[PDB]
Amino acid sequence: MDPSSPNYDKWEMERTDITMKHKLGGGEVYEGVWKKYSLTVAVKTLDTMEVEEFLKEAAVMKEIKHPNLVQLLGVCTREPPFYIITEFMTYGNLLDYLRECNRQEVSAVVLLYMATQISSAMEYLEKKNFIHRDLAARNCLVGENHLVKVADFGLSRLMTGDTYTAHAGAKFPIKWTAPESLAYNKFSIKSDVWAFGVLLWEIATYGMSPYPGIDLSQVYELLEKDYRMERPEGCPEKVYELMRACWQWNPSDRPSFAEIHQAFETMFQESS
């Protein structure tokens, strides 16, 4: 826009500057090119019932910056249809990736690195007192040299699979949702820690669906009296001990991300 103008927004960019394309199977995200720089990018778009919510996401994205969080390049919220441009992550989402990778190339060390990256992003978000709400591998993205960034798709309605079910005013990744949050709709950074713990598990197992076989309805009950996923084949003892600490029934017991990242750094440096 216009610098002197009263509504100047650095992030608002020319909608013509982006050569929209086809969908990256998802709201809806297509893949786009930013002609100016010949760079492929991710464009998230929206007569729908969540405008206050979209622009909110835009707004937030404008406040966060970190090497391990998907990067917002610009927006298009001056005139509809509403856009949201972020860098593209050639490898798509962490969960499929883990399911279609060459495990010789994606060994234990690499998997330990991915967790370290993710933990680092969460430490930031924790420092900025920001609550993710839906941390999980389907929500992390994969780039070159095993670069992993944390994101948010708003998979809630995009998905209905069996991943998400109704609790509160909507759907919730039951298997990723912490106790307190399933029972009181209490979401905190400690709730994200829980989910992280699960995401770890997703990582340890190259992308296997959590609490396999178990039905959503019974998840809480089990966790209630202290039941947990078992260490996955190949997972180091120290990693696993970590998951458990994340999975403590009392939020205040769960380690901070600052602590979680400090533990990984020490492990990832000891292994490379």
Ligand SMILES: O=C(Nc1ccc(Oc2ccncc2)cc1)Nc1cccc(C(F)(F)F)c1
């Ligand atoms: O991530 C967000 N939007 C988004 C847009 C496009 C996407 O698609 C895609 C992009 C790149 N490469 C491939 C695909 C994926 C996610 N929004 C968001 C809201 C709140 C918090 C965060 C976080 F803390 F995680 F950073 C992010």
